[PDB]
Design a protein around this ligand. Sequence first.
Ligand SMILES: Nc1ncnc2c1ncn2[C@@H]1O[C@H](COP(=O)(O)OP(=O)(O)OP(=O)(O)O)[C@@H](O)[C@H]1O
Ligand SMILES: Nc1ncnc2c1ncn2[C@@H]1O[C@H](COP(=O)(O)OP(=O)(O)OP(=O)(O)O)[C@@H](O)[C@H]1O
Lengths: 334, 620
Amino acid sequence: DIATIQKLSKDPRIVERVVASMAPSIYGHDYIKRALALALFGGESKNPGEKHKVRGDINLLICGDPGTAKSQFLKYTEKVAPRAVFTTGQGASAVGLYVRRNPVSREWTLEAGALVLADQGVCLIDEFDKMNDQDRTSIHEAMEQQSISISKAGIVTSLQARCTVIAAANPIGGRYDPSMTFSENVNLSEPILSRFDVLCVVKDEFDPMQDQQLAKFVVHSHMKHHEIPQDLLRQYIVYAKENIRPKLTNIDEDKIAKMYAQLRQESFATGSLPITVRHIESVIRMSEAHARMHLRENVMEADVSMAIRMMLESFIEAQKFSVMKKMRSTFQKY
Amino acid sequence: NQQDAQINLQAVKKKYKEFIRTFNEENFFYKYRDTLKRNYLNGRYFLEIEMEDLVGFDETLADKLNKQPTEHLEIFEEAAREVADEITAPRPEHEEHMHDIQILLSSNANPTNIRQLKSDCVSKLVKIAGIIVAASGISAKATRMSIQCLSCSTVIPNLYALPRKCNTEQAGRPKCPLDPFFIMPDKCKCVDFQTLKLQELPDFVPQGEIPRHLQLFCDRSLCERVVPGNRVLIQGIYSIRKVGKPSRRDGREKAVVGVRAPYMRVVGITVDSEGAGAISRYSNITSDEEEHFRRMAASGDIYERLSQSLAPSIFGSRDIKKAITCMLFGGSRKRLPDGLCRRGDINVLLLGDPGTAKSQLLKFVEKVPIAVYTSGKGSSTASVMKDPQTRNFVMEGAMVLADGGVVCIDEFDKMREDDRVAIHEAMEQQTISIAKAGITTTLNSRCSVLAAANSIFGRWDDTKGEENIDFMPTILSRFDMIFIVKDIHDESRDITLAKHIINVHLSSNKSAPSEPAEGEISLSTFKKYIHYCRTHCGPRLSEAAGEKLKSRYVLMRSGAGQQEKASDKRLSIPITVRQLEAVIRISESLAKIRLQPFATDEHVNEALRLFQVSTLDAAM
DNA sequence: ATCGATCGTTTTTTTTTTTTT
DNA sequence: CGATCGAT
Ligand SMILES: Nc1ncnc2c1ncn2[C@@H]1O[C@H](COP(=O)(O)OP(=O)(O)OP(=O)(O)O)[C@@H](O)[C@H]1O
Ligand SMILES: Nc1ncnc2c1ncn2[C@@H]1O[C@H](COP(=O)(O)OP(=O)(O)OP(=O)(O)O)[C@@H](O)[C@H]1O
C-alpha cells in the first residue's frame, strides 16, 4: 500500500482531483483553490553560474473583503504542509525578539525573524494590511533575493531566507470597490508595488440559487454529529517537491513575448500597475508547478497554456466595467 | 626505547632522515633540500610538503601518520634540523648556532564540514573549508626554560607538575622543601601564539538553523598569515585541552560526567582558489601572470570588453555601466604636507523603478577582492564593549573591514537617521572618530560605498520636479554619478528582454556557448587584476586636461545657475568643489585601468559624458 | 593505642553601551 | 586548621 501513488497518480483527470482536497469548505472558488494547490509544492532553484538563486518563492495575494472567509483557508495548509509557524498581523517591528555575543547577561538571546526560523516552508500571517509600515518595509527583500543580511550588533553575519509568504490581508474603503481601479482600493507605497502574484479577489454579488445550493451544503456540513483523503497526498507532495527536479525545453517560449506585449500595449496607464519581470517568471513557476503536479519534468503547450488560462481570467477580474480587454484580445488565443 | 615498533628511533634513525636526500628526479630539482636551504637563507625556517609522497615512497607511514601525528610531526622537525645542519656547515665553521624550524602539510583530498567534526574525528588529521571572522592578537608561548632551584632547562613533551624535593639541598640538613621554583626567563624561549578562528560554510546545514564556528591555535609562522573574512582550505587536527570522566564532577552544577572542550590547532593551513579565492594580501603570483596583466593592459580593447563582464545574463544599461566598475579601482590618495588629504576612494548613487535588477547587481559587485553587504535596519556608534574576561573596555569598533575594499548598500531610504551620521561623515574624511568612554582613538579606514535607493512616488517625482529624495540634499552632495532607473515602454525592448532572459532561464542554459563571447571572462581574473592595479600606480593629471575640465565645470555651474534664472528660481544641483574633486577620481580610475600614469583629456571626455548623466538627470 | 610531627590550606568586584518599543 | 602517618 505504497504504490498508492502509481495505481492512480498518472491519470488525465488528476489535473482537478487535487482541487477536491485543498480545504473542503467552499462551494465556489476554484481559482484560489488551484493557485494554492500548485504553489504548495512548486519550486525550482536552478542556480546558474555564481549569479544568484532565483526562487523557491511566490507571493500569491487575495485582497478581498473584511469578512469573507479567508483566514480559515490558511489553516488546512498548515495542517497538511510540512513546516510552519503561526503569526497574525501586527507582528513585531520586524526586527524580532541585534545581540552582542557575551557571557554577560548569560548570552543575550538570539534570532532575527521567522523566515530565518522557517526556510523552504511556511510561517503564517493573518490580517496584515492594518500593520506597521515599518514591517512592510522590512520583509521587502526576503521574498525575492531570498537572503538576509544584518548588522547593528557585535556581528554583521548573514543567513538564508528561502520561503514563499502567506497573504491574508484586508481591503480599505469599507468592503470592496466596484470594477473601478485597484490602486484606489488599498493604498500601498511605490517601492513595494514591485512584486506581485496570484491576484484573486472575493468580489460579491447575490445569486439566490447559489445561496440555496451552498446553504444546503452548509447545513449538511452542520449535520455530521457523532475523493482524496488527507491520508495520502501529504506524502505525494513531500515526494514531489523533494525528489523530482523538473526542467523545461524550447517548445513555444516566444509566445510569452507577445503576451507580455499584450500587457504593455493594452495596459499602459489604465490598469497596468508595475507588474515587471517577476510575475512573468512566475509564468514559469506555474508551468514547473504543473509538471510536478504530474511528476512530468518536461512539458508541451499544456502547462504553460494553463498558466495563460488562469492569468487571462484574473487580469480580466481586476479591471473596470470595461472588463474584457484581454478577453476580446484572446478569443483568438482561446 | 623499546625497539619493536612505534619506536622513537627507526623513523628518525634513517627513514625520515634520508627520505629527502633520497627524494629524486633528474632535472636535479626534485628534493626538498634546495627549497629548505634557500628558505633558510632568507630567515624563513620552514618548507612545504605533500601527504601523498609516502605512496611515492612506501605504504606504511601514512596509516601510522594519521594515528599519532603529534609525535611524527616533531620527529620530522628533529630529522629536519639534523639533516639540514650538516649543510649549515660550509665547513664546520658557520653554524654559529642551530635554530628551530616548522614543517607544512598539504593535500587535495577533500574538504569536510563542521557538522561532522566529532568524537571519532579527534586527534586526527583532516580537511575542511570554512570562512574567517576575526582572531586574536599575538600573545606569547615558549618551549622550555631553566630554574635557579635546579638550573636545568625544563624539558616537556606537551605543547606543569613541579615536584617536591628542593635541589638547593646542599645546605646541610637545612633543606628547602615545598616547591621552591624560581623560573629563570633569562633561560626561557619564545614562540608565537595567535588563536585563529573559523566559521562554517554558507550551504552546509545553516538551513533550518544557524551556523556554528570554531577557534584555533598556532605556534610559529602562521601568525601574520590570515586576515579575517577569507576562505580557507585547511589541514588541522581536532583535540582537547582538559580531561576526566569520574565523579570529580566539574564546577558548581556542571559536567554530569565528563564534558571537555573543543578546538583545533593547525598543521598546515593553506588557502582557497575560488577563481582567486585567497588573492587579497600576499603574492604567490608569477611573471606569467604579470605579463598577462600588462599585455591585456597593452590591449586597447579591454574597457568595452569589461563593460560586458557583469552582464552576461543582463541586458541594457551600457551607458549606465561605463563606470559601474570604475568605482572598484579607486583613484589616488593624493595627500599633502598640510591636512588636505583630498578624497581618495569613490562613491555612487542609483535609484529608480524596481524590476530593474539592483539587488542582483550589487550581489555581483560583492562577488567580483573585499566587500560586504547588508542594507538598512543595520556593516556598522562604533562598538565599545566591555571584555567579559577582566572587564576592560575594548573596541571591536565594521567599515574597518572596508579598509581599502568598498561597500554597497541599498536601503539608505528605509533606515532611520539615528544611524546615518557617523557614516554621513566617515566618507568625507575616512577617520572613524571615538570619544565615548576613556579613549580618543580617531580610527580610520578607506572604504567607498554604493548607494541604491527607492523613491516613494516613483517616476511621478521624476516627471515633474522636486520630490527626488525624501530625506536630505547633504547626501545628494557626497556622490558623483547618480542614476535614474525607469522602465519606459517599447515592444521591441519588451520582446528582446523576453527571449534574452528565457534563453538564460532555460535548463541552466549557458555552460558551453557562454564564455565563447569575446574576452568578458573570469571575475577571478578581476579579483587579481584589481588587487594588482590599485596596488601600484599613483597617477595624476596632465596639464592639457586641467584647463578644459576646469572650464567645463565652469560652464556646468553657469548652466545650473541659468536654469536657476531660466526659471526665475533655483533650478540646479549645488555646483560643489566635490564634483570636480570626484571627476578627478574618475580620470584616476581610467588611468588606473590602462596603467598609463599621465592621463589626457580625451581619456576623460568619457568621464564628461558619464557624469553628464547625473547633470541631465538633475536638470529637470 | 597513644602522641606528636607530617602533610596541604587562600579569596574580591558595579557599572557602561547599544538595543527595542 | 585540618587530616595523614610514623613510632613508642
Ligand atoms: N464555504 C464556507 N464554509 C464554511 N464557513 C464559511 C464558508 N464561507 C464563509 N464561511 C464562514 O465565514 C466566516 C469568516 O470569518 P473568518 O474566521 O474566516 O474571518 P475572516 O473571514 O478571515 O475575516 P478577516 O480576515 O477580515 O478577519 C468563517 O466563520 C467561516 O466559517
Ligand atoms: N533587465 C533584466 N534582465 C534580466 N533579468 C532581470 C532584469 N530585470 C530584472 N531581472 C531579474 O529580476 C529580478 C529582480 O529582482 P531585484 O532584487 O533586482 O529587484 P530590484 O530591481 O532590486 O527592485 P528593488 O530595487 O525594488 O528591490 C532579479 O532576479 C533579476 O535577475
